[PDB]
Amino acid sequence: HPETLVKVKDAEDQLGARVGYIELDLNSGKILESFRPEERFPMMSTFKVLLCGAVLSRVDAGQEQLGRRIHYSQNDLVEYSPVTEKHLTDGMTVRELCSAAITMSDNTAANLLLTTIGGPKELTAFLHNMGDHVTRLDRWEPELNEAIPNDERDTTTPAAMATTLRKLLTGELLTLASRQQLIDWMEADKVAGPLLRSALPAGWFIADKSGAGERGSRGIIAALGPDGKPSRIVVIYTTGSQATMDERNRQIAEIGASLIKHW
Ligand SMILES: [Xe]
Ligand SMILES: [Xe]
Ligand SMILES: [Xe]
Structure with missing residues (x-):
């Protein structure tokens, strides 16, 4: 929805940094x-x-x-x-x-x-x-979080990540049992509380995975939907901001509120 893209633009301007987004x-x-x-x-x-x-x-x-x-x-x-x-x-x-x-x-x-x-x-x-x-992984924990500007190591694009997650969760690659296990682990995420989950209405499904790293890097990938059933994948990334963790959390939660609002 156009309103959600405004929130993303809002977030760019307030964080002083790039934000990538896919629904x-x-x-x-x-x-x-x-x-x-x-x-x-x-x-x-x-x-x-x-x-x-x-x-x-x-x-x-x-x-x-x-x-x-x-x-x-x-x-x-x-x-x-x-x-x-x-x-x-x-x-x-x-x-x-x-x-x-x-x-x-x-x-x-x-x-x-x-x-x-x-x-x-x-x-x-x-x-x-x-x-x-x-998408490319080049390094191990914790060096892969270094987020050097213009360094392409350990990066994805919002579009690559969104389509890859869709294939892993719902595509032909994995067996039904492995697809269900992957999404079950994501549903049980314990360290993404202040992000999309904070905008999520009661009874909605969410399976997600957050990330944070150096130089203001923050992000989340998620499958979510009403009625206890995912129907949408959402990917949000940002890097470069000097903003606090708390502000970056609230920006993601704000983008989440608009996505939910205009579902
Ligand atoms: Xe899913
Ligand atoms: Xe959300
Ligand atoms: Xe963000």
Whole structure:
């Protein structure tokens, strides 16, 4: 809706930074609104949904099992590892590592999972092979959040990310069981409370994944809809602002309110 694009423009001007935006009909696959759709933005932790998409594709092929237990070391623990720091002794299953990476945005969980698929280059190869030749992961946690201006490492475009998420969630790539698992992890997101969720009316469905990084980088990807059923994908990114986390949160929530208002 035109009003939602105004909010996005509002946000650009108030944050002093680029904002990228896509609304995508999940059923028809039609793009409903777009803003800077072909511009690059750091993915930050939003890449963790793609990562577990790659992991689930390996589970489908039998190259990975959700119950496989991975043990690791104190040395493996990087900044912000709220779940993995608790399981040095017992290890964690692949299933638990994806849950930690997606619902809590656990950084060591994401690095361990990246190791299982062969690293950033292999995540990018996975995306390439499902028809996303735009998104690229180059680095590990936490360096992938560096968001150096004009640095294309670890970036996506709002359009690439929106269509890739649609394919992972509703397309032919993953089995029905793996699609449902991916969206189930996203629905159980615990670290995106002040964002789209804050504008979400009672009874609406949302499955999402947020991200934040250096140099004002902030974003979210989501499938949402009324009546407890997703019907739309929404992608919002920003980078470059000197604004506080709180202000960037409110801008995203404000864009959310307009999207919901004009559904
Ligand atoms: Xe979905
Ligand atoms: Xe929302
Ligand atoms: Xe934003």
